[PDB]
């Protein structure tokens, strides 16, 4: 059916990063774009933690994104050239926290084609022009100046479509107020095709062509052309004018050639290699990430080598020519995809795998514990300054935001005791690899509990000035406890509210005298336990407490409320003015007083005669209940809270009645919510007040801006409800159960257990039920290969003095993966490590090692086919595992006994094969698919005996799902082909063929004839077989926009609908729910048709283009577009509700029902 797909987890890996003054002020907004979504942060850099200022979804992939400011422009407009031809230039207004489109320049057809410009987009330093170019034979320079109102004075772009001129790197040079220029590394590829022997293909060389665009002539011509024999992998441009020379540093293998367009010297700064680097010398040190951090006059250049160490470079050019660039390794840096170093302690390093680092500057940036390799520093033309892994003395990484990308493997189960299931995403590369197990519950960022289950847990602080709850009085009838609200709440004797008796209320109502409603009455209790306990009205205990800033109405049985008024000393003294309600007041609350008001305008108590009596708390009008919020049923509580204000009586039944909390009596409208008595009081959730209808279905009448709406929350089950304010979040809903508090964000705890190699396949043992995963870091030096290379380097450099000690230090400690980058090289070399993490503990209870050229292709620890139900693990290791080109020695399928019921990876024996057996499953024997050959062999511990082997497959076997005498296998060509594997007949005949050609990388059996496939282009297609050389019909199809790693048709959330959970390699996780409700599907289709007209996509490619970029979309409903329509503005929401012929609150209720349907 139709699939209302919603992404539960956003993609964590940032596809691009920009920074600058994009917030319109001195707050340097930095936007990390994760593909279709971009999060911009312009918070305080002295906080040390990243806080995103805005988030924008464009429904498209940006081919090239940048952020540049005009001449005099304090706001850096972001220019994004997407796959579509609408290159969007938008000035970002942080007042609306959104980028208003100044222009949407149309260029051409959708997709980043070879001739579709916008693959490389840059801007001039004066903000006068923007150049967008394709891979080859297409370039454009749009003259976008500043208008009279500082608007986009855009023009038609000058075309620089030079034939077969591939631009390796293009950068707009800083020309100041003169005519600007742009340098592109053009390479004439026409001579390569002209020479049929490839002689001109070998003799071709790049040329940095700096083309100057005369704006007065309105024409761009190639001004300078510096040819380089070495190809330019990347280039960094020195800023001209007062910021330095107008030069560029083209990077190569241990050579950054800095030169300017004119009489300048080509200063070849050598990239400083590590002192006795254990990595091989084939990996030349090039500037993978470069960032020019500029001061008021000069500019330092932080660059990362092939090892990736952060090397700060000075500039002793002396305004004549490029002479010296003192590249000293200031700090050892981790595996980062990019690095941008702004000012005021901001240095955002986006990690390809692991944690992206935001750093604060400590030293001046030149604090290098390693050697310095200047451009004027001479050498022997064979190495550089031996700059080893230095300590981080220049700056400190103040934030390390862990990203799930690249999420290779996944294992989601509710094995652990948590409010939501733990999903372990195995991710990362090499030693910098971990499995992050995340469990929600629904913001379970931190775990904290109040001390016991007391009568009330309220902040009876030292005074009113104590904003943090240093002593929240969790006071019961037996005793009292003091809890610290810092997610470290426990029991202590520092509450001071005299809660040895039953303290019903204990909160700092006065300036320093906390009001405590207790059986003694109303007590003014100080920072210590000095409670002046005046009597309440009557000798009974304080049943209700309408506490305000000045007068606290302590109401006993019969509704008699004694007014503990504030004296001149700040204490609460019980005055003689007391009024009785209709019956016994159950619970009370007082609305907040104004700044000129002497006391509260309305304090309301919920009597037992189905009413809430509200009186003025001022001493001139005390004990005068005017407003009567008459409850519909017998009221269990009252809450008289601001936003005029609302005074509500909540009942034990399903009706709570709210009226106007004022001197005039309002209309008691009774709204509905779990068969429990209500405990409506003051709560905090997203800056809006609420009254908690305490029930099993814990609803909150949120009175946001004089309108109370009651609904439940998406947390775990409970019986009561209250507010929540701790170190995890500032305001939330605590569904209070019996010694439990379900968190509602009106966040998942993730623990990352490390792995030895890059993670390949996460499997579970049959007997242990524990994660026996296999990690394969192929095309790199292994752990055993790295130890052997370290010992070989020790034996090589021991021949000398101090060189033998340096050799021993290089053997003991190389460049680390988390410190200075992993020293690893080779093509056929491959690390394989089978780590058996426990079912509860992420630490590996077993380690199995393979050959140094062998990659663990698959992990499968289950019961053996030849043996009984004992877990025998079949682990395939492909030796000499080289990816590009096709080079592998062979697949050794090690059969392992899996000792301690799988907790010890004891390898029994192995069975070799020439091909790679990437699939090994049980088939009624065991089907092992070694490429195009699938053999049914006995799964013995010693050796396998094959019976029937079929080599009729096309390319390979990516993965086969078996549904009983039929297995559908994915291939590089076919998405899914179903062969009826009759193991009783010892044969396999293809009962279903394939017509759609797709390199499907995932498999999921939704039914006995439904097979899902996640293609290499990032399209999820669910194909059902036809009833009774015939293909299966693709019932559903969508394009997610990213390559989905795994997919499984299963109910991922707790209960709800049997959706399909898909995990992508970018860190995204989504649930596609098959909506069987045709009326709800038609309502969602009408809402999407309204939303596609109301809210346009910012990339220029529509949501239809995003969902049908590769293959056409079918049977999918866009819950992301439904969330965008919910996130639309108020007038646009009213227009969308008129277009869908409904209400905006009804559409929001339908979206909340779709979210709760899971």
804-823 mask for another protein (x: CB under 8 A)? ------------------x-
Helices then strands (H, E): number in the chain? 9, 87
Whichever of 866 and 1108 has its CB closer to another protein, that residue is 1108
Whichever of 159 and 796 has its CB closer to another protein, that residue is 159
Give the other-Cβ count within 10 Å of 822's Cβ: 25
* 704 is an interface residue for another protein by CB under 8 A: no
Tell the smallest beta-carbon distance from residue 857 to another protein (Å): 13
* 972 is an interface residue for another protein by CB under 8 A: no
Segment near another protein (CB under 8 A); pick from 187-195, 216-224, 736-744, 845-853: 187-195
Site for another protein in 44-83 (CB under 8 A): 61-63, 83
* 406 is an interface residue for another protein by CB under 8 A: yes
Whichever of 339 and 485 has its CB closer to another protein, that residue is 339
Segment near another protein (CB under 8 A); pick from 192-200, 207-215, 320-328, 1029-1037: 192-200
* 112 is an interface residue for another protein by CB under 8 A: yes
* 430 is an interface residue for another protein by CB under 8 A: yes
Phi/psi region, residue 465 (left: phi>0; alpha: psi -120 to 50; beta: rest), is alpha
Segment near another protein (CB under 8 A); pick from 161-169, 313-321, 888-896, 971-979: 161-169
* 85 is an interface residue for another protein by CB under 8 A: yes
DSSP structural state of residue 320: T
* 192 is an interface residue for another protein by CB under 8 A: yes
**Token pair recorded at residue 1026:** 């036809």
Site for another protein in 774-793 (CB under 8 A): 777-780
**Token pair recorded at residue 72:** 């005099």
CA dist list (Å): 410 to 436, 971, 1004: 9, 21, 14
* 156 is an interface residue for another protein by CB under 8 A: yes
Strands 1116-1118 and 2-9: parallel
Tell the smallest beta-carbon distance from residue 119 to another protein (Å): 5
CA-derived radius of gyration, the chain: 34
Of 337, 442, 628, 743, which lies in the binding site for another protein, with binding defined by CB under 8 A? 337
| d(C-alpha 847, C-alpha 784), whole Å | 14
Q: Which of 412, 441, 344 has the alpha carbon at shortest distance from 42?
A: 344
| d(C-alpha 821, C-alpha 430), whole Å | 10
* 231 is an interface residue for another protein by CB under 8 A: yes
Give the other-Cβ count within 10 Å of 464's Cβ: 16
* 341 is an interface residue for another protein by CB under 8 A: no
* 668 is an interface residue for another protein by CB under 8 A: yes
* 1067 is an interface residue for another protein by CB under 8 A: no
Of 92, 99, 287, 702, which lies in the binding site for another protein, with binding defined by CB under 8 A? 287
CA dist list (Å): 1132 to 31, 88, 896, 1121: 26, 22, 62, 14
**Token pair recorded at residue 237:** 């441009």
Tell the smallest beta-carbon distance from residue 1045 to another protein (Å): 9
* 770 is an interface residue for another protein by CB under 8 A: no
Whichever of 522 and 668 has its CB closer to another protein, that residue is 668
Whichever of 1043 and 1135 has its CB closer to another protein, that residue is 1043
* 228 is an interface residue for another protein by CB under 8 A: no
* 601 is an interface residue for another protein by CB under 8 A: no
Of 52, 233, 900, 924, which lies in the binding site for another protein, with binding defined by CB under 8 A? 233
Segment near another protein (CB under 8 A); pick from 149-157, 362-370, 482-490, 901-909: 149-157
1112 CB-near residues (< 8 Å, 6+ apart)? 1037
| d(C-alpha 1126, C-alpha 290), whole Å | 40
Site for another protein in 602-621 (CB under 8 A): 610
* 159 is an interface residue for another protein by CB under 8 A: yes
Of 154, 555, 734, 927, which lies in the binding site for another protein, with binding defined by CB under 8 A? 154
* 13 is an interface residue for another protein by CB under 8 A: yes
Of 48, 111, 239, 265, which lies in the binding site for another protein, with binding defined by CB under 8 A? 111
Of 100, 567, 667, 1082, which lies in the binding site for another protein, with binding defined by CB under 8 A? 667
Tell the smallest beta-carbon distance from residue 782 to another protein (Å): 11
Of 416, 883, 954, 989, which lies in the binding site for another protein, with binding defined by CB under 8 A? 883
* 114 is an interface residue for another protein by CB under 8 A: yes
Strands 165-173 and 1033-1039: unpaired
Segment near another protein (CB under 8 A); pick from 9-17, 498-506, 1019-1027, 1080-1088: 9-17
Give the other-Cβ count within 10 Å of 847's Cβ: 12
Of 7, 12, 28, 119, which lies in the binding site for another protein, with binding defined by CB under 8 A? 119
Whichever of 127 and 654 has its CB closer to another protein, that residue is 654
| d(C-alpha 831, C-alpha 849), whole Å | 8
Whichever of 74 and 706 has its CB closer to another protein, that residue is 706
Taking the C-alpha atoms of 707, 712, 715 and 716 in order, what is their torsion angle to the nearest 10 degrees? 150
Tell the smallest beta-carbon distance from residue 1111 to another protein (Å): 15
Q: Which of 473, 462, 578 has the alpha carbon at shortest distance from 512?
A: 462
Residue found under tokens 């904003």 = 467
Taking the C-alpha atoms of 71, 76, 77 and 83 in order, what is their torsion angle to the nearest 10 degrees? 120
Whichever of 684 and 778 has its CB closer to another protein, that residue is 778
Give the other-Cβ count within 10 Å of 727's Cβ: 15
* 680 is an interface residue for another protein by CB under 8 A: no
Say if CB 736 and CB 691 are below 8 A apart. no
Say if CB 716 and CB 656 are below 8 A apart. no
| d(C-alpha 662, C-alpha 836), whole Å | 66
* 1020 is an interface residue for another protein by CB under 8 A: no
DSSP structural state of residue 899: B
**Token pair recorded at residue 183:** 């340098």
DSSP structural state of residue 764: B
Site for another protein in 290-319 (CB under 8 A): 306
**Count of residues near another protein by CB under 8 A:** 91
Q: DSSP 3-state assignment of 1092?
A: helix
Alpha helices by DSSP H, listed for 133-235, are: 190-194, 199-203
Site for another protein in 626-655 (CB under 8 A): 630, 632-633, 651, 653-655
Segment near another protein (CB under 8 A); pick from 211-219, 665-673, 948-956, 1134-1142: 665-673
* 16 is an interface residue for another protein by CB under 8 A: yes
Tell the smallest beta-carbon distance from residue 308 to another protein (Å): 8
Whichever of 112 and 661 has its CB closer to another protein, that residue is 112
**Token pair recorded at residue 81:** 């050239």
* 168 is an interface residue for another protein by CB under 8 A: yes
* Burial class, 109, CB count within 10 angstroms (exposed 0-12 / middle 13-18 / buried 19+): exposed
**Token pair recorded at residue 829:** 């070399």
Phi/psi region, residue 972 (left: phi>0; alpha: psi -120 to 50; beta: rest), is alpha
* 109 is an interface residue for another protein by CB under 8 A: yes
Segment near another protein (CB under 8 A); pick from 184-192, 261-269, 857-865, 962-970: 184-192
Site for another protein in 1039-1058 (CB under 8 A): 1041-1043
Q: Which of 393, 435, 434, 432 has the alpha carbon at shortest distance from 412?
A: 435
* 446 is an interface residue for another protein by CB under 8 A: no
Site for another protein in 568-587 (CB under 8 A): none
Strands 77-82 and 62-68: antiparallel
CA dist list (Å): 532 to 364, 500, 526, 733, 1033: 58, 14, 9, 33, 80
Site for another protein in 999-1018 (CB under 8 A): 1016-1018
Phi/psi region, residue 675 (left: phi>0; alpha: psi -120 to 50; beta: rest), is left
């Amino acid at each position: 059916m139709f699939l209302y797909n919603l992404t539960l987890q956003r993609a964590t890996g940032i596809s691009f990063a920009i920074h600058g003054n994009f917030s319109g002020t001195k707050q340097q907004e930095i936007v990390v774009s994760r593909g279709k979504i971009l999060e911009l942060l312009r918070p305080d850099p002295n906080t040390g933690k990243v806080h995103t200022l805005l988030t924008v979804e464009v429904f498209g992939v940006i081919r090239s994104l940048m952020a540049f400011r005009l001449t005099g422009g304090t706001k850096d407009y972001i220019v994004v050239g997407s796959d579509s031809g609408r290159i969007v230039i938008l000035e970002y207004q942080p007042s609306k926290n959104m980028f208003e489109k100044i222009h949407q320049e149309t260029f051409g057809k959708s997709g980043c084609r070879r001739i579709v410009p916008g693959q490389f987009l840059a801007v001039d330093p004066k903000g006068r022009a923007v150049m967008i170019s394709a891979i080859e034979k297409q370039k454009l320079v749009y003259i976008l100046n500043r208008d009279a109102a500082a608007r986009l004075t855009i023009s038609s772009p000058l075309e620089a479509h030079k034939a077969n001129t591939l631009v390796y790197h293009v950068v707009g040079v800083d020309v100041g107020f003169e005519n600007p220029m742009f340098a592109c590394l053009e390479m004439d590829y026409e001579e390569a095709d002209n020479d049929p022997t490839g002689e001109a293909a070998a003799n071709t060389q790049q040329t940095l062509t700096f083309y100057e665009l005369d704006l007065g002539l309105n024409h761009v011509v190639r001004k300078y052309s510096e040819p380089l024999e070495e190809h330019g992998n990347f280039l960094i441009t020195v800023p001209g004018g007062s910021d330095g020379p107008s030069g560029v540093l083209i990077c190569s293998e241990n050579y950054i050639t800095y030169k300017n367009f004119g009489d300048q010297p080509d200063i070849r700064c050598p990239i400083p290699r590590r002192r006795n680097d254990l990595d091989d010398p084939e990996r030349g040190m090039i500037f993978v990430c470069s960032a020019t951090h500029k001061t008021k006059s000069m500019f330092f250049f932080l660059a990362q080598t092939e090892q990736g160490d952060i090397f700060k470079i000075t500039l002793e050019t002396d305004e004549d020519m490029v002479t010296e660039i003192r590249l000293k390794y200031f700090d050892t840096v981790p595996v980062a995809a990019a690095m941008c170093v702004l000012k005021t302690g901001f240095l955002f390093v986006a990690s390809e795998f692991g944690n992206h680092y935001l750093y604060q500057i400590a030293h001046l940036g030149d604090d290098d514990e390693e050697p310095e390799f200047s451009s004027a520093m001479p050498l022997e033309e064979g190495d550089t300054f031996f700059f080893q892994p230095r300590p981080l003395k220049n700056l400190v990484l103040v934030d390390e935001l862990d990203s799930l990308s690249p999420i290779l493997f996944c294992q989601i189960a509710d094995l652990a005791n948590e409010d939501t299931p733990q999903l372990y995403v195995a991710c990362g590369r090499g030693p910098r690899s971990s499995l992050r197990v995340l469990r929600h519950g629904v913001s379970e960022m931190a775990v904290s509990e109040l001390p016991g289950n007391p009568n009330a847990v309220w902040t009876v602080r030292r005074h009113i000035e104590d904003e943090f709850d240093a002593y929240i009085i969790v006071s019961f009838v037996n005793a009292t406890l003091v809890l610290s609200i810092g997610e470290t709440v426990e029991e202590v004797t520092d509450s001071g509210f005299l809660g040895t008796t039953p303290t019903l209320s204990c909160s700092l109502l006065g300036d320093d005298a906390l009001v405590q409603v207790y059986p003694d009455g109303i007590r003014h209790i100080r920072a210590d336990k000095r409670v002046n306990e005046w009597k309440t009205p009557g000798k009974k205990t304080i049943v209700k407490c309408a506490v305000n800033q000045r007068q606290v109405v302590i109401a006993l049985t019969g509704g008699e409320l004694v007014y503990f008024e504030m004296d001149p000393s700040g204490q609460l003294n019980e005055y003689t003015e007391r009024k009785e309600m209709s019956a016994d007041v159950v619970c009370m609350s007082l609305a907040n007083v104004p700044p000129g008001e002497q006391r509260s305008r309305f304090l309301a108590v919920g009597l037992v005669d189905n009413t809430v009596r509200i009186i003025s708390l001022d001493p001139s009008d005390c004990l005068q209940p005017l407003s009567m919020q008459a409850l519909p049923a017998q009221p269990e509580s009252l809450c008289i809270v601001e936003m005029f204000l609302y005074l509500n009586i909540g009942l034990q039944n399903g009706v709570l009645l709210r009226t106007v909390l004022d001197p005039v009596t309002g209309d008691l409208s009774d709204t509905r919510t779990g068969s429990r008595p209500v405990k409506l009081f003051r709560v905090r959730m997203q800056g809006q007040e609420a009254v908690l209808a305490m029930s099993s279905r814990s609803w909150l009448s949120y009175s946001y801006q004089s309108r109370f709406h009651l609904t439940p929350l998406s947390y775990e089950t409970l019986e009561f409800a209250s507010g929540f304010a701790s170190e995890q979040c500032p305001e939330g809903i605590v569904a209070i159960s019996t010694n439990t508090l379900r968190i509602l964000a009106l966040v998942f705890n993730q623990v990352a257990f490390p792995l030895q190699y890059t993670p390949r396949k996460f499997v579970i043992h049959p007997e242990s039920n524990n994660l026996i995963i296999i990690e394969t870091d192929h095309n790199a030096y292994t752990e055993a290969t790295k130890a052997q290379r370290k010992q070989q380097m020790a034996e090589e450099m021991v021949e000398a003095e101090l060189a033998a000690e340096m050799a021993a230090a290089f053997l003991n400690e190389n460049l680390p993966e988390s410190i200075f980058g992993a020293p690893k090289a080779g093509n056929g070399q491959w690390a394989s490590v089978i780590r058996v993490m426990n079912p509860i503990q992420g630490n590996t209870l077993d380690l199995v090692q393979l050959e140094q050229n062998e990659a663990a292709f698959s992990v499968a620890v289950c019961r053996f086919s030849n043996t009984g139900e004992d877990w025998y693990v079949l682990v395939g290791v492909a030796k000499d595992l080289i990816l590009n080109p096709r080079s592998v020695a062979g697949g050794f399928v090690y059969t392992y006994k899996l000792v301690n019921n799988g907790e010890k990876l004891e390898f029994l024996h192995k069975t070799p094969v020439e091909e790679v057996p990437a699939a090994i499953a049980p088939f009624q024997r065991v089907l092992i698919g070694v490429g195009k050959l699938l053999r049914v062999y006995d799964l013995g511990k010693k050796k396998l005996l094959r019976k029937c082997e079929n080599k009729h497959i096309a390319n390979y076997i990516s993965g086969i799902q078996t549904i009983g005498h039929r297995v559908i296998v994915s291939d590089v060509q076919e998405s899914f082909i179903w062969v009826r594997y009759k193991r009783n007949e010892n044969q396999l005949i293809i009962f279903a063929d394939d017509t759609y050609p797709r390199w499907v990388t995932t498999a999921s059996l939704l039914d006995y004839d439904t097979v899902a496939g996640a293609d290499k282009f990032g399209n999820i297609c669910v194909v059902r077989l036809p009833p009774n050389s015939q293909k299966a019909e693709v019932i559903m199809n969508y394009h997610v926009g990213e390559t989905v790693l795994s997919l499984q048709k299963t109910t991922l959330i707790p209960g709800g609908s049997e959706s399909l959970v898909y995990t992508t390699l970018s860190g995204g996780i989504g649930i596609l729910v098959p909506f069987t409700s045709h009326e709800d599907h038609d309502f969602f289709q009408h809402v999407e048709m309204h939303l596609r007209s109301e809210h346009p996509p910012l990339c220029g490619r529509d949501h239809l283009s995003f969902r049908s970029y590769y293959f056409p979309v079918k049977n999918v409903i866009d819950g992301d577009l439904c969330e965008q329509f919910n996130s639309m503005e108020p007038n646009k929401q009213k227009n969308v509700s008129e277009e869908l012929d409904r209400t905006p609150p009804e559409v929001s209720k339908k979206l909340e029902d779709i979210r709760t349907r899971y």
